[PDB]
Amino acid sequence: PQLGDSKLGESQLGSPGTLKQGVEWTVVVDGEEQNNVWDVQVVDTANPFGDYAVFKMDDRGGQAFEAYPRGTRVEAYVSEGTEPLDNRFTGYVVERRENE
Amino acid sequence: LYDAEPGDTIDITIDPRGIDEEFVIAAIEYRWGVDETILTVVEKRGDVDD
Amino acid sequence: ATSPEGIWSNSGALTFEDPADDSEILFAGVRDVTITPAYEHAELYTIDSTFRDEVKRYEHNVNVEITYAKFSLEFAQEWLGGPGATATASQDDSDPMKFNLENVTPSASGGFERTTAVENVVFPELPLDSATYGEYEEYSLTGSGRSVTNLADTSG
Amino acid sequence: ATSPEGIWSNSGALTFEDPADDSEILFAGVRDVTITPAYEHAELYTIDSTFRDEVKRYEHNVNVEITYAKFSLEFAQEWLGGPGATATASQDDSDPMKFNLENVTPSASGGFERTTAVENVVFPELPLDSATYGEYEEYSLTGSGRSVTNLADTSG
Amino acid sequence: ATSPEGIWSNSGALTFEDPADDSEILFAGVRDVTITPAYEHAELYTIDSTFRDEVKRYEHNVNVEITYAKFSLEFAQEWLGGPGATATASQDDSDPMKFNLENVTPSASGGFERTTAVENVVFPELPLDSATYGEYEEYSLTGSGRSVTNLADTSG
Amino acid sequence: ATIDGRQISESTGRYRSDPSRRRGI
Amino acid sequence: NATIDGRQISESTGRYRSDPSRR
Amino acid sequence: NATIDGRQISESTGRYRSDPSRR
Amino acid sequence: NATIDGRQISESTGRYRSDPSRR
Amino acid sequence: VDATLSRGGTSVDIPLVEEGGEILLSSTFGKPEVNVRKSGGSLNPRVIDSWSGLQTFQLVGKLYDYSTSHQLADLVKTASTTPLELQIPQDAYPDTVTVAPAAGQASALTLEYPAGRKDLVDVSLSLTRVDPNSVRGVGDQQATTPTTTGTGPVEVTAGGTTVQLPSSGLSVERTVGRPNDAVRRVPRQADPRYEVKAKVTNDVFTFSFETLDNIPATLNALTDNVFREQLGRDGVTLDFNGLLGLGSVKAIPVGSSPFRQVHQAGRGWVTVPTLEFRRIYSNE
Amino acid sequence: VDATLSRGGTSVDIPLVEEGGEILLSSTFGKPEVNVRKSGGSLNPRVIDSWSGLQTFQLVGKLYDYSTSHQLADLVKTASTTPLELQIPQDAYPDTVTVAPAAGQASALTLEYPAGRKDLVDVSLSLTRVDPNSVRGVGDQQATTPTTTGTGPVEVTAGGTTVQLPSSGLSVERTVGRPNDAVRRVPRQADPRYEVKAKVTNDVFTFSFETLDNIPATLNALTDNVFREQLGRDGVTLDFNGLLGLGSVKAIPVGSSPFRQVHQAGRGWVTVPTLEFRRIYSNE
Amino acid sequence: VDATLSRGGTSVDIPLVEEGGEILLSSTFGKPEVNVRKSGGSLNPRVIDSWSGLQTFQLVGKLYDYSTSHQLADLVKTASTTPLELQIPQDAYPDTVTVAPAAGQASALTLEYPAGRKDLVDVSLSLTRVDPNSVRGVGDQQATTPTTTGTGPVEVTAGGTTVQLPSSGLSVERTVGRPNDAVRRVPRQADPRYEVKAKVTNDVFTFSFETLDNIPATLNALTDNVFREQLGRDGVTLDFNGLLGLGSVKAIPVGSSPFRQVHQAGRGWVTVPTLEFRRIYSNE
Ligand SMILES: [Mg+2]
Ligand SMILES: [Mg+2]
Ligand SMILES: [Mg+2]
Ligand SMILES: [Mg+2]
């Protein structure tokens, strides 16, 4: 359980938790994590072609739109299973778009 | 293949297409949601942008 | 309260009335009468229990069925005509003749007099001829009233 | 354990109660009484056998049916009135009158006294008039109770 | 093999047992007993023949129906209670009381003794009161057993 | 199912120009 | 009814359909 | 089957589909 | 579900839909 | 026993009672977000399971007053960041689940007021399970069903003409839903995130009746003033005049089949199987 | 009793008789052209209603003559700018309405000639209401059903082989429609505009029968010559030989399921549930 | 009596037997590739028939042992360029036809093992006629069903926890298909070309049961461990433990509604109408 809720000896430690499985991408904007990401595309490509990333997020009252002015730092980290986070993309914002 | 970069070499076997080779990676695209790693092999070449 | 008591069938007086006038439609020679108020009962059961939780009434009617042995031209021609009308032929209209029905029966040893009154009794079909060799013509009506308007002791 | 014994139909005393007050609703002149607790049975089978795996009870009711020959105004007006009320006319509401029922019957050789108690008996239809030429009015109730509340030897 | 012989109904000893203890549940006064093992038969027909190709069995049960004239408080309260319990009221649970049934019957001129044993007989409904004017109460059980455990000549 | 050619071409324009924007002009 | 970025790509052809012969 | 300005945009893949197992 | 040259053009919008009210 | 649906201070009890062998509760479990590979060189596909699952509850029951039915409609239609909590009276479920009206659906709630029944409303609820801590939104829109105390007929007013709907065979159904709310996948939670949107909802009234007398006049008045006229930005005023305790709503018939006149062989009257009205802007 | 469908001097009376409580006349009113806003910051949508409505008539009835049945099919299929006028025997409808065969449909008219049922033809008609003054077009194309006075079997000719269809359980269905006609929205008025196009129509013959004797030969001849051959630009000659008064038509079976051989357990014969033919180019 | 389905050495006899008047064989003939013009200035369209037709066989039968059932599943799922031959015991067909499993379908073979039945399996097959000489491909992939001689309950293992499925009311359905094989049009001949692909097949196990005892514990174990966890690339072990002679497969529940819990009025237990599992990568 969480600390403070187990009467000692009453519960198995760590439960109801289990090992991470699946792929998780986290997006870091100027050093802060973006919570409401639901899709990520990252392209890494040889010299004639531009490396780019597209992040798709849910927003409320335009609050997240304000976090991504042009030129702001964005990092995409990936982890599959219990493997440590790899920084797979670093870049800067060129376009923020919000639509219905 | 989150470790992989363009310029790296990879073994590819596709029996339906008679491929069994080492190729250079020209590009990688990672897509969440669909869980796809899209390897461009040998050379990337454009369209209207070219 | 009144004691439950036997009722003798032959002591009944059945009257039919036009609901417009409250005028008597001539009817006689009954042999059987059944009056049955009814509702559709929904018997409701819950998720985790074998037992019934509720039962609710809907869709009220009074089943009226009468057997009789005397033919009434008035009753028949009123049925044919529909509301407010008398006819000697089938009418191509959608309005059935509504009858007000009342049955008055004394109890077998005089404890009460039972009046049953039923509004807007309609009959889907009318037996005109009901002949069988060596018998008097016997007529069976099945019908539905809207509601019971009176069920009371009507002794003095 | 009590030896199985014959039961004589004419020895049975049937009483009806309002579930609110536990007051008697006057009822007499019984000729037939069937009381049957019933469940639906689901018979369940496995994948590699012709034989039954399990059988399970669902959807409980008590089938009550009574034939009687003494008319009760109280019983009829209680049915018309719905819960906690009496009426002389049909009521336009969705709550049916629930009755508590008790049948007390001695065994033929006095070995035991069978009390059957049934809760929340409802009758979808009430026979008011049930006349047949040359007969006393005989009334049939078919209804469903929620459960059997008591089945015991009440001699002591 | 044993010569076929007449069987006289009044000679049958019917006994009910609890499958937990193999203890006798007191039962008497049988008037009719029908025991019938049954399977669903799939009668299978083929591509252009009119004749039946094959037939297969696919859902076994034993139909048990009993008419009896002596009321058992044990049998009734065991039925109410479900497996391994006795109750004076309806139980809101999904387990029906399973009975082991055995009938023993001599043949009419001593050729054999017919023993029929049926496992896990369950009755969807139990008649508690079955009153008709001028008669002893007659109770009808209908139910299904899982299988016939024994059909043999049990004579010495 | 009738598809509007102006709607498709106008909606996709953002994506058609993007490879070029990635490469300069 | 089909959308790209929430805009409809279906044409507003004002052509009617009405349900076929019952059979 | 879809159309832009009356021309079919569906590919004439000469590929068969046939009815599934009944169940 | 729609494809151009075997690749899906349906957007993987992570939006749920669930069975309508029964009536 | 009885199922509670609540949002803060507001609470509605739904009896979860039905006749005989009817389905009271359906719970569907889904993995809509698994990628099963459509191709590849093996006999069997590779898969990946990397997102929240679906749980859907379909609740069927009956309500014993109209007031509670309107409260249920209001509760379902309301846009609020306060969790909608569901209490299921069956041991296989936790005491409370946080829910959204069905995730993309026009019909989350169906209320039926059938003919010949009094104080007995059929309820069908479709609800999606969501993460209790991931109810996200900015807007707040309290829904109100208009209520009044009359006895009068159902009146359709358009272009200065009022049409009274026949009482005969009169059956009413209301569907309510929130299709503009987003229920979205989350990486490593069991349950999705609920984006509450202060946006357009679904609210539809369906009537069925038999037209018995003044038949041409009644049907013609409706079809002349509603169907053969351009209603503009406005619509029909649909007034219940206190039937079911309901008041006055602004509406329009939508689509290809909102009204139907049916003539059957041997019958001297016209059946209306559907007269369907969607509620329009008036909540200013 | 009768409904009259007419175009200039051509007039067909349709009895509008049916059994029991079957639906004889359905009229659907709609507003396909209302814009209801899918989104927006209101609880309830804004709407705009700016265009013509929709009125659809569905007529079920019977005809007592095959000659009249062919006239009805010819009348429905014909391209002409002369109004198709419908007279309905019910007071809710104006004495005449201008109609198009159902707007987008391949199936405006169904005529069934069932087994048994001598001189009884089942009619189903779908018609769309159009503005009497807004019937527009260039071409006249008179549709003729080929008619002859023989007794002979239904014969199917392809590639010099002729197959006689079994009389046993024989049912015929004909389906007619005009999907290439435009029914178009207009502002400011009640009814749409009808654009009559001298273009391809739908005309389909469906057969149902039971093959009782010479089963391999009969079925093989049809399958080998029609289904296993390429027919090219030409097709199949479908000759009725005077059954129902019908003659010779050029047709082809179209699609995935135009023909089925059904074998049932315990039966010594083959059922053909459908054999479906579409009429091809033949007028010069 | 029996239809023989075979591929070289491997042969299965399917008894074409069913109850009463059920359909044992349906053969559908089609022309999927006929071009019928949508328009043109004619009344009737011009056509062109240039390609192979379609013949679809649907076989309903019954198998009398589980061993033969598994052999049939393996025969249908196998990728091999050895022709699959169908011998039909009816005179309207040639002695052998060459077949593919249904051309684009997830369900070519359905096998039902219903409750109450021993040594009796329901078979539904859908097959497409292909040119004997046009069976083209590279790869052999031998399908095997894992078999064992146990008696144990059906077990579902996910994340270290095993659930035992109730024996009560237990039914199994197995669906097999080859949707990734291409059946393709060829000019100038009757039958299409079969491209055998050593690629992903469809293999689905569906279960139906009643949960009678330890109801929360049983259902919660399944829903917690299978549905509310992320399974990753790995999935669920589905082990038959020798029921029907079957063993252990790796699987996952796929889609929007693979599991349902059903609660009915007046019942003390939970129905599971469906629990669906698709077989995932295992086969080296
Ligand atoms: Mg602890
Ligand atoms: Mg753990
Ligand atoms: Mg790079
Ligand atoms: Mg680059």
Author numbering:
A (entry chain BD): 2 to 101
B (entry chain BD): 303 to 352
C (entry chain B4), D (entry chain B3), E (entry chain B2): 2 to 157
F (entry chain QH): 317 to 341
G (entry chain QI), H (entry chain QG), I (entry chain QE): 316 to 338
J (entry chain BB), K (entry chain BC), L (entry chain BA): 2 to 285
Sentences from the paper on this structure:
Here, we present the near-atomic resolution structure of Haloferax tailed virus 1 (HFTV1), an archaeal virus thriving in extreme salinity. Through single-particle analysis, we obtained near-atomic resolution maps of DNA-filled and empty virions, enabling us to assemble full atomic models of the virus pre- and post-DNA release, including all structural protein components. The full atomic structure revealed that the virus has a length of 1350 Å and an icosahedral head with a diameter of ~600 Å. The tail has a length of 560 Å and terminates into a baseplate with three radiating TFs of ~190 Å in length.
The final TTP hexamer is followed by the trimeric BTC, which in turn interfaces with the trimeric BPH. Notably, the BTC protein is a pseudo-hexameric trimer: Each subunit consists of two homologous domains, which have likely arisen through a gene duplication and fusion event. The BPH coordinates Mg2+ and K+ ions that likely contribute to the stability of the complex, and connects to the BTC via a triangular ring, from which three globular domains project. Curiously, these domains show an asymmetric configuration. While two of the domains are bound to each other, one remains unbound. As the binding interfaces of these three domains are equal, it can be assumed that they are free to interchange. This suggests that the three BPH domains may undergo dynamic cycles of binding and unbinding, which in turn may aid virus’ docking or penetration of the S-layer. Specifically, the three folded-back TMP termini interact with the trimeric baseplate-tail connector (BTC; gp41), while the three extended termini engage the trimeric BPH protein. The BPH also anchors three TFs. The C-terminal end of the BPH contains a predicted carbohydrate/galactose-binding domain, which may interact with remaining glycan residues on the S-layer or lipid-glycan carriers embedded in the membrane.
